[PDB]
């Protein structure tokens, strides 16, 4: 019922070879629609989902232009940050920026965000209220002050509560067939014998969307958190996702364990036991 | 108080040459904009830089135009070769991110560019001054002098009233724009008018000196001149009249 | 990427409220501002707005109806000093490139409390019996016109101000090299009131 639009940007300095790598991606929920790669011949924001191809030349020239402006700011930032941390020019470093907005079931504005990281660590972030910033360390305090003097929060705040939401609404219209869809997982279970006295139960959940899913193992009606394996939800590569969970049980006790799943797709939350 | 500085402010030149317009942004600003304004088309953005790199130049004409910023405090607009259709007023502007978010831009004084097919039509003005009517005097106890710059081309002029060796503004009106003495013709020469009105008692005083001054913008040393007439260089032509109670 | 604006010129008497406005046909615009430009001088930002709304700033009021793609600027208590060319400008969130209107010329006519319309013949300072004609002291309600004879030069009305003495006046000048040109003929193409023509 609730939707979102987010942009992820990555910039990495390549000290020994011209420009730094710059990658930008856009996402509506868990489905991607745009991309830009500094090292792509195109040097254009490109479509990555059929429902966005629709947009005319004014839209592409605008984003291309905007994303190029992004690629520049970051390029400058890597220099600025190299200085704030007083680092050598020999090693590579990474800046990451992520922003976007979430809308509710009514599709109105719920919240907006803008997070900025350095070398895989929080650097500065726009607070809940969208009027103030949070500085991870003293280096960001310099950017924090600079941004407040440049009234940078207002511009974002205007963007998030305004434009990103209004575009989020638009994209939600043009690609309904896919954006408002929900696919319950195709779930099953497997049993693999081990030791001739112990065994592994793996619980599977495939072809589901969105990517938000849950899996829990229970032992005689109690949550089994230890001795259980769980891998990060993985993409199928066709818009659907995949995820599993395993537990190690002593032999002859497989009926004590029950796998559980939660997902917008399933009308009722499932419960799975090993039958054959 | 040191704003954007464009250079030169007036440029009268012959086609087929490289015209160079310069601009120095406000120290600290890192966005520079080039605009042109042709009376028949309004303001057009030609190009704009950010940290010295051309960000948007859709406004640039496909060929014969070239802008650039070798450094944070200097931008260049070159036009080669010069053509008439390029004559207009060129503005420069600088600004910062916090200022642009509110669409604030600091503009320069501009540069009036007039490009001529031939310099044989370039003439300076004939400045004359007309003294008040005795009829106006005894009918309203005030005296209006009139100035008249005529036959000049192009219309790069700046008229000013000078009294007792000092400039004056109070009580002066000058025609907003010079007029064409022959509107139908393309090379038409121009004329300009101004009025200065003093009190009856002030004009009626032999000590009071009245001078009308017109600054003209024409050729420089680098321009040839294969004619008997005088070289119509940038200059000041003046008319003067000594007040008289008479 | 088109912006439409009527060029005027539009005249209103000193003290009245005047409306200027532009229209556009690109929904991508979301920044709207107004510039003021005096002849032979540069443009000065007056009002700026973002999306829809009404902004007051003393004597100026900017408005923007995004539904209608229509923007307006109101000037209250018009003063002759407000006379100039007004330009609108707008843009989207894609570039700092502003798009301008062709501009609307404004001319706020001054208050002349003691109008004394008369036409005078002014003698030339040095040159032998040269002259010029000076229509003057007529009220702002009067429109001066060009001459039908192409060898006769006439200027528009021009407001003179003697602030030290609180007194402004309208004036227009006419002249020719033609020996058929006299002050009695000059201005006959214009509609002047029933004012004074002294012979000598």
């Amino acid at each position: 019922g609730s939707h979102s639009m987010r942009y992820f940007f990555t910039s990495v300095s390549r000290p020994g070879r011209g420009e730094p790598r710059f990658i930008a991606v856009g996402y509506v929920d868990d489905t991607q629609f745009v991309r830009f790669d500094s090292d792509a011949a195109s040097q254009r924001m490109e479509p990555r989902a059929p429902w966005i191809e629709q947009e005319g030349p004014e839209y592409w020239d605008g984003e291309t232009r905007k994303v190029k402006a992004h690629s520049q700011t970051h390029r400058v930032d890597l220099g600025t940050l190299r200085g704030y941390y007083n680092q050598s020019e020999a090693g590579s470093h990474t800046v990451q920026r992520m922003y976007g907005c979430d809308v509710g079931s009514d599709w109105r504005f719920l919240r907006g965000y803008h997070q900025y990281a350095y070398d895989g660590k929080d650097y500065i972030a726009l607070k809940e209220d969208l009027r103030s910033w949070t500085a991870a360390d003293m280096a960001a305090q310099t950017t924090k002050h600079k941004w407040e003097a440049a009234h940078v929060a207002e511009q974002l705040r205007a963007y998030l509560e305004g434009t990103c939401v209004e575009w989020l609404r638009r994209y939600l219209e043009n690609g309904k067939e896919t954006l408002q869809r929900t696919d319950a997982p195709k779930t099953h279970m497997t049993h693999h014998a081990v030791s001739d006295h112990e065994a592994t139960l793996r619980c599977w959940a495939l072809s589901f969307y969105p990517a938000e899913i849950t899996l829990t193992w229970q032992r005689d009606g109690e949550d089994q958190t230890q001795d259980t394996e769980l891998v990060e939800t993985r993409p199928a590569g066709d818009g659907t996702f995949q995820k599993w969970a395993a537990v190690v049980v002593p032999s002859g006790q497989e009926q004590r364990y029950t796998c559980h799943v939660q997902h917008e797709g399933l009308p009722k939350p499932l419960t799975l036991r090993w039958e054959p | 108080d040191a704003g954007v500085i464009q250079s030169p402010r007036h440029e009268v030149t012959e086609m087929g040459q490289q015209v160079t317009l310069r601009c120095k942004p406000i120290s600290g600003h890192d966005y520079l904009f080039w605009y042109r304004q042709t009376m028949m088309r309004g303001l057009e953005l030609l190009i704009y830089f950010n940290n010295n790199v051309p960000i948007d130049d859709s406004g640039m004409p496909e060929d014969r135009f070239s802008a650039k910023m070798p450094n944070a405090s200097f931008s260049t607009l070159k036009i080669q070769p010069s053509e008439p259709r390029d004559s207009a007023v060129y503005f420069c502007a600088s600004s910062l991110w916090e200022k642009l978010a509110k669409n604030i831009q600091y503009f320069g004084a501009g540069t009036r560019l007039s490009v001529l097919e031939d310099l044989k039509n370039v003439f300076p003005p004939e400045v004359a001054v007309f003294e008040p009517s005795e009829a106006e005097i005894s009918h309203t106890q005030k005296a209006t002098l009139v100035c008249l710059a005529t036959g000049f081309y192009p219309d790069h002029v700046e008229l000013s009233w000078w009294v007792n060796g000092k400039e004056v503004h109070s009580g002066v009106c000058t025609d907003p724009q010079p007029l064409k003495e022959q509107p139908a013709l393309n090379d038409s020469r121009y004329a300009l008018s101004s009025r200065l009105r003093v009190s009856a008692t002030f004009w009626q005083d032999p000590r009071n000196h009245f001078r009308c001054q017109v600054q003209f913008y024409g050729l420089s040393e680098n321009d040839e001149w294969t004619q008997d007439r005088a070289k119509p260089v940038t200059q000041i032509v003046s008319a003067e009249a000594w007040g008289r109670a008479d | 990427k088109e912006v439409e604006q009527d060029p005027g010129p539009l005249s209103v008497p000193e003290g009245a409220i005047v409306s200027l406005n532009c229209t556009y046909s690109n929904s991508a615009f979301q920044y709207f501002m107004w510039y003021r430009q005096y002849s032979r001088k540069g443009p000065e930002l007056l009002m700026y707005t973002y999306s829809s709304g009404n902004k007051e700033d003393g004597r100026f009021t900017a408005q923007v109806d995004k539904s209608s793609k229509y923007i307006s600027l109101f000037i209250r208590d018009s003063q002759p000093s407000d006379s100039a060319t007004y330009l609108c400008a707008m843009r989207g969130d894609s570039s700092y490139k502003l798009i301008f209107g062709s501009g609307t010329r404004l001319l706020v006519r001054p208050d002349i409390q003691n109008p004394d319309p008369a036409v005078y013949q002014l003698r030339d300072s040095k040159s032998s019996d040269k002259s010029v004609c000076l229509f003057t002291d007529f009220d702002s309600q009067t429109n001066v016109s060009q001459s039908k004879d192409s060898d006769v030069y006439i200027t528009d009305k021009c407001v003179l101000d003697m602030r030290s003495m609180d007194f402004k006046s309208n004036s227009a000048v006419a002249w020719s090299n033609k020996s058929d040109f006299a002050c009695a003929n000059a201005f006959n193409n214009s509609i002047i009131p029933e004012d004074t023509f002294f012979p000598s």
């Binding site: 232009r65 402006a69 700011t73 600079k146 941004w147 | 991110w97 | -």
Partner: peptide, 10 residues
């Protein structure tokens, strides 16, 4: 739509 014209420098 992306935020623009450009973001602020850090």
């Amino acid at each position: 739509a992306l935020w623009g014209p450009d973001p602020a420098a850090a």
